[PDB]
Design an enzyme around this catalytic site. Structure first.
Site, mmCIF file in Angstrom:
data_model
loop_
_atom_site.group_PDB
_atom_site.id
_atom_site.type_symbol
_atom_site.label_atom_id
_atom_site.label_comp_id
_atom_site.label_asym_id
_atom_site.label_seq_id
_atom_site.Cartn_x
_atom_site.Cartn_y
_atom_site.Cartn_z
ATOM 1 N N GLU A 1 1.113 -0.813 -0.024
ATOM 2 C CA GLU A 1 -0.205 0.218 0.049
ATOM 3 C C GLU A 1 0.727 1.221 -0.636
ATOM 4 O OE1 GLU A 1 -0.238 -2.504 2.392
ATOM 5 O OE2 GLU A 1 -2.406 -3.442 1.667
ATOM 6 N N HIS B 1 7.946 9.616 -19.033
ATOM 7 C CA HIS B 1 7.231 9.896 -17.655
ATOM 8 C C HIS B 1 7.603 9.057 -16.452
ATOM 9 C CE1 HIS B 1 4.787 12.944 -19.590
ATOM 10 N NE2 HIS B 1 3.829 11.871 -19.998
ATOM 11 N N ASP C 1 7.469 14.264 -27.444
ATOM 12 C CA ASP C 1 5.841 14.634 -27.785
ATOM 13 C C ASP C 1 5.344 15.238 -26.935
ATOM 14 O OD1 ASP C 1 4.032 14.031 -24.976
ATOM 15 O OD2 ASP C 1 4.760 12.305 -26.625
ATOM 16 N N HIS D 1 3.764 16.424 -24.668
ATOM 17 C CA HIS D 1 4.551 16.264 -22.745
ATOM 18 C C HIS D 1 5.512 16.263 -22.301
ATOM 19 C CE1 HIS D 1 -0.391 14.358 -23.328
ATOM 20 N NE2 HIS D 1 0.079 15.512 -22.371
ATOM 21 N N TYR E 1 -2.411 9.614 -28.777
ATOM 22 C CA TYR E 1 -4.368 9.297 -28.682
ATOM 23 C C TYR E 1 -4.552 8.404 -29.396
ATOM 24 C CZ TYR E 1 -8.708 8.875 -27.055
ATOM 25 O OH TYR E 1 -9.744 9.074 -26.441
HETATM 26 C C1 LIG Z 1 -9.683 14.155 -24.106
HETATM 27 N N1 LIG Z 1 -9.271 13.220 -23.951
HETATM 28 C C2 LIG Z 1 -10.228 11.988 -23.701
HETATM 29 C C3 LIG Z 1 -8.309 13.170 -22.742
HETATM 30 C C4 LIG Z 1 -7.828 14.254 -22.353
HETATM 31 C C5 LIG Z 1 -6.400 15.336 -21.858
HETATM 32 C C6 LIG Z 1 -6.069 13.112 -20.795
HETATM 33 C C7 LIG Z 1 -5.198 13.323 -20.013
HETATM 34 O O1 LIG Z 1 -4.347 14.641 -19.191
HETATM 35 N N2 LIG Z 1 -4.693 12.028 -19.028
HETATM 36 C C8 LIG Z 1 -3.409 12.284 -18.143
HETATM 37 C C9 LIG Z 1 -2.768 11.189 -18.417
HETATM 38 C C10 LIG Z 1 -1.342 11.170 -18.941
HETATM 39 C C11 LIG Z 1 -1.453 10.612 -20.407
HETATM 40 C C12 LIG Z 1 0.315 10.539 -20.726
HETATM 41 C C13 LIG Z 1 0.742 9.889 -22.333
HETATM 42 C C14 LIG Z 1 1.412 11.012 -22.897
HETATM 43 O O2 LIG Z 1 0.359 11.234 -24.184
HETATM 44 N N3 LIG Z 1 2.770 10.758 -22.652
HETATM 45 O O3 LIG Z 1 3.568 11.644 -23.760
HETATM 46 C C15 LIG Z 1 -6.369 12.692 -21.138
HETATM 47 C C16 LIG Z 1 -7.867 11.995 -22.056
HETATM 48 K K LIG Z 2 8.166 16.678 -25.013
HETATM 49 ZN ZN LIG Z 3 2.201 12.571 -24.307
#
Ligand SMILES: CN(C)c1ccc(C(=O)NCCCCCCC(=O)NO)cc1
Ligand SMILES: [K+]
Ligand SMILES: [Zn+2]
Ligand SMILES: CN(C)c1ccc(C(=O)NCCCCCCC(=O)NO)cc1
Ligand SMILES: [K+]
Ligand SMILES: [K+]
Ligand code: NA
Ligand code: NA
Ligand SMILES: [Zn+2]
Lengths: 341, 341
Positions: A106, A159, A195, A197, A323
C-alpha cells in the site's frame, strides 16, 4: 530503416485508468501499436524485427534498483493483499514528508508513483521489459553503424523517472536506449522529446548527468500534464548543469512557433556535441489529437523528421505518446519518411 | 459537557472513493455523524447546540490562503472543465519536482492533495466550513471556562496539512480549535491525536511552532496510511523543535501497550506546559474496525478518556476517524464518559 517491435507489448493490457474522476478503459491500448505498425509498413518501412533477449544491466544504470525490484512484484503483492481492482496508488510523498520507504504494498506503490491515473496490472512488468528490449536493439543498430532505426516501444516511458512510474510509463525506453549507446562507445548522447508532454521522467534521470543532453518541446506544465516539471528555468544540476533545455509552449501553438523551438534545441544539441540523438517520438501534438492543445498537421511530421535528421548524426526514434486517433500511424510514418529523406 | 454539532455536515456526501483500485462508496459517510450523535445523547450528553457563523480569520492562521481559495471553487472548476466524475487528483508534486503552482484545475487539484482516495464533491467546501465552525465553538466553551466539550466534527481534519487535503479531510478542525484557544488568551496548547492514523496534517501545521505541542499515537507509518509521516524521529523543526512526539505502534497493539504510550504523551504535554488539550478522537483503533490493526475494546475508551482528563487541564474533544461498525457511537460516548467522570 529497421523497425524493432515486440508482440509482448500486448501483455500490457490494463483494464482501468483514472480519468475525470472515473475508472475507464486506458487510452494507451494495444491497438495503438497495431495501427502504428501497419502504417509504417505501408509507408515502406517493412523491415520489422523482434527484439533480442537482454538482461537488466543497462536499465540498472538509469533506474533505481529498489524501483525496478518493486515493479517486478508489484502486481503479485497487490493481489496477495486481497484487493479487487488493479494496482493504483493513492498516497504520495509530497511536500514536507519523510524520505523513508514504506514496507507494505500500500505504501510502496505511492512511494514509487508520480501519477495515479496509471494502474499496474498483470503483464505490465513483462511488457515493459519487452519494450525496453526493443529500445536496446534499436540502439545497437545505431552503434553498429545504421543512420536511423525505429523502436516501436509500448508501453512508452518518458514519464518514468529514476524511481517512479506514471503517465502509462514504467521503464524509460529512451533513457535505456541512450545509456546503451554510451555503453557501446559513445561519450555524449542527446535525447530529443517531441511528444506533446514534457518527458519529466527522462529529465529526472539525466538532470545531473553531464554525458547526456535532454531537450523537450511540450505544452506548458502550468496547464498540462505532468504539471510539475518542464519549466524553462530547469537547465540541469551539479554534474549535469546546463544539460537540460525545456521549451514549454501554450495553447494553439502552430508549427511556425513549434519549429523555432525545434531549431533552437537542435542548435543546443550540436553545441553539446552529441554523437547520436534518441528521439522520444510522440504524435499527440497533432491538431486532431484530443489530449493536446498544439496545432500540428500531418505534413509537419515530415518536416520534423527532416529537420532532426539534418543534424548529421545517427537517430534512434523511440515511440512515446499519441492518442488512438485514425491518423496516429500516418503521422508516425510521416516522421520516419522525413528522416529517410 | 456540551456537544457542538452541525447539520450541514450532510452537505458532504461524496458518491465515490478510490480503494483497492476501485471506486467504492465513501467510508466517511454522513451516517457516522448520526450514529455518533445518537449514542452520546443516549449516554446522557443531550445538550446539543449548533455552531454560530464564523469568519476565516482563525483558519487563515493555520492553513495556507491559496489552499483555502482553491477549496472554495474546486468543485465548480472541475465540473466546468467538463469532467463526469468527482474531483479526484492524479498528478502529484513528488520527489525532485518544481515548486511552482499550476494554473489549471487539473494541475492545482494535485498540487493541493496528498491522498487520491479523497474526492471533492458538491457541498464539500460548505460542509468543511460547518465542521470548522463546530471546532471553533467548542474552543470558545473551553475559553469561557468549561472543563470539557465535544465537537462532533464531520468531515474530519487531521490529514489536512498546511496546504493540502486528503484522508477525507479538508480543513484541520483540531488545528483551528487550538489556534482559537490561543487567540482567546492561551499561550500554550497541546493537541493529542488518539485516532488510529497519524495526524500528519496537524503535525505539518505546527511542526515549526513553539507555542503548540503535537502528540500522536498511531499505526506504524511503515505499513499504515498516511505512510509518509509519523515516525518517532520527527520531533519538530526550527522555531518548533521539540514540540512533536510520535508514537508509532505495530499490528495487534492492545491497550496494554497503547496505554503506555498515552501516559508518556501526557507526561510530555504536561512538561510542555499546555493550558488545554485538544483531543483528536478517532475510534478507528477499535478491535472490530476494518481499516485499522489495533485491538482496543469498548471499555478501553472509558479508561482512555479518564486518563486524558486526569491531565488536569481543560479538554476539547474533536471527532476524527472511526468507520463501519455500529459500535462507533458507543466507543465515542465511552471516551466522553471517562472524561466527564
Ligand atoms: C480528451 N481526452 C480523451 C483526454 C484528455 C486529456 C487526458 C490526460 O491529460 N491524461 C493524463 C495522463 C497523461 C497522459 C500521458 C500520455 C502521453 O501522451 N505522454 O506523453 C486524457 C484524455
Ligand atoms: K516533450
Ligand atoms: Zn504525450
Ligand atoms: C477493510 N477496509 C474496508 C479498509 C481498509 C483500509 C483502508 C485505508 O487504508 N484507506 C486509506 C484512506 C485513509 C483513511 C483515513 C480515515 C481515518 O481513519 N483517518 O484517521 C480503507 C478501507
Ligand atoms: K490537439
Ligand atoms: K493519531
Ligand atoms: Na544531462
Ligand atoms: Na509545535
Ligand atoms: Zn483514523
Amino acid at each position: 530503416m529497421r523497425v524493432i517491435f515486440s508482440e509482448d507489448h500486448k501483455l500490457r493490457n490494463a483494464k482501468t485508468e483514472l480519468y475525470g474522476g472515473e475508472l475507464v478503459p486506458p487510452f494507451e491500448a494495444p491497438f495503438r501499436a497495431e495501427w502504428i505498425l501497419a502504417a509504417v509498413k505501408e509507408a515502406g518501412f517493412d523491415d520489422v524485427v523482434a527484439p533480442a533477449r537482454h538482461g537488466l544491466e543497462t536499465v540498472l544504470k538509469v533506474h533505481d534498483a529498489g524501483y525496478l525490484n518493486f515493479l517486478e512484484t508489484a502486481w503479485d503483492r497487490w493481489k496477495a493483499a486481497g484487493y479487487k481492482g488493479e494496482a493504483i496508488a493513492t498516497s504520495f510523498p509530497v511536500r514536507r514528508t519523510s524520505p523513508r520507504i514504506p514496507t507494505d504494498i500500500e505504501g510502496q506503490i505511492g512511494y514509487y508513483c508520480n501519477a495515479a491515473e496509471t494502474a499496474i496490472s498483470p503483464g505490465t512488468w513483462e511488457a515493459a521489459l519487452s519494450s525496453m528490449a526493443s529500445a536496446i536493439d534499436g540502439a545497437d543498430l545505431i552503434a553498429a553503424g545504421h543512420k536511423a532505426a525505429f523502436s516501436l516501444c509500448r508501453p512508452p516511458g518518458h514519464h518514468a523517472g529514476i524511481d517512479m512510474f506514471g503517465g502509462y510509463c514504467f521503464i524509460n525506453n529512451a533513457a535505456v536506449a541512450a545509456q546503451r549507446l554510451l555503453d557501446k562507445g559513445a561519450k555524449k548522447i542527446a535525447i530529443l522529446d517531441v511528444d506533446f508532454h514534457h518527458g519529466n521522467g527522462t529529465q529526472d534521470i539525466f538532470y545531473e548527468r553531464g554525458d547526456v543532453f535532454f531537450a523537450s518541446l511540450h505544452g506548458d506544465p502550468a496547464e498540462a500534464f505532468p504539471h510539475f516539471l518542464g519549466y524553462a528555468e530547469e537547465t540541469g544540476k551539479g554534474a549535469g548543469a546546463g544539460t537540460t533545455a525545456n521549451y514549454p509552449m501554450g495553447r494553439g501553438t502552430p508549427y511556425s512557433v513549434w519549429g523555432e523551438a525545434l531549431t533552437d534545441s537542435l542548435k543546443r544539441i550540436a553545441a553539446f556535441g552529441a554523437e547520436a540523438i534518441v528521439v522520444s517520438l510522440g504524435v499527440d501534438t497533432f491538431e486532431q489529437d484530443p489530449i493536446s492543445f498544439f496545432k500540428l498537421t500531418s505534413p509537419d511530421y515530415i518536416t520534423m523528421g527532416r529537420t532532426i535528421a539534418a543534424s548529421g548524426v545517427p537517430l534512434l526514434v523511440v515511440m512515446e505518446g499519441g492518442y488512438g486517433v485514425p491518423e496516429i500511424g500516418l503521422n508516425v510514418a510521416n516522421v520516419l519518411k522525413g528522416v529517410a529523406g
